[PDB]
Amino acid sequence: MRRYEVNIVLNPNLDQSQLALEKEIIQRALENYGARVEKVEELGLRRLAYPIAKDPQGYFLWYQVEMPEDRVNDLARELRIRDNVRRVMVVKSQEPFLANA
Amino acid sequence: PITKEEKQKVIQEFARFPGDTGSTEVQVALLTLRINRLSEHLKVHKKDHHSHRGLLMMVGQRRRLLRYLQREDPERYRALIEKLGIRG
């Protein structure tokens, strides 16, 4: 059990019929691998700094979670499987480290 | 990794007296944990010869500790080796 931030980037061009599908697939997957979502943040549609899946934009999600560490890779394997899921970065959550006081 | 809870379970179990955290028994049990844990990793990862050096160290450290115990008090050397399942 440790805190991870699960970043996800979706096809910008979805409608909320299509999006909620994905968003629910991710929810069902999270829960499936024993991930208890804490925070969550639909920053949504962003202009990427380079094209991704030929697309100038990505729809962005962020899920802070606590899960068993030994299942984290397998979850990222699953989250990626879907087509409209175009990036997945899972990152052990870290203390912030500041410059300036 | 060994958790803070897991390591303390071993220490209680082997401490000659509460608040005993060093001591040849606790040390040698603490090492055994590491050694078994690490032997298991090497099992899967035969090619990690760097972590293996550390194993060699721990094995030799425990060997040394146990030699000291066998020399000062031989009964609790035996009592321990039994309790821990080693020198075989």
Binding site: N7, L48, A49, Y50, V91, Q94, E95, L98, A99, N100 | -
Partner: protein, 70 residues
């Protein structure tokens, strides 16, 4: 010009999503700037590069953009 550090208040250099801030450590060619320009410590500069890259992968910042006017 100035040092980039000397330009911003209390900021977290683990935050690979503050692209608003990070792009500022990145030169007009997308290159991670050296310490003589970021004016970071050695340690800070490494935390930074790490998160800059994490961000580049996420799509937020460039690995490379192009030099304008020769």
């Amino acid at each position: 010009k100035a040092k980039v550090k000397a330009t911003l208040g209390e900021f977290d250099l683990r935050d690979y999503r503050n692209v608003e801030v990070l792009k500022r450590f990145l030169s007009e060619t997308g290159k991670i700037l050296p310490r003589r320009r970021t004016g970071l410590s050695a340690k800070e500069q490494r935390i930074l590069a790490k998160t800059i890259k994490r961000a580049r992968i996420l799509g937020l910042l460039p690995f490379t953009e192009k030099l304008v006017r020769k």
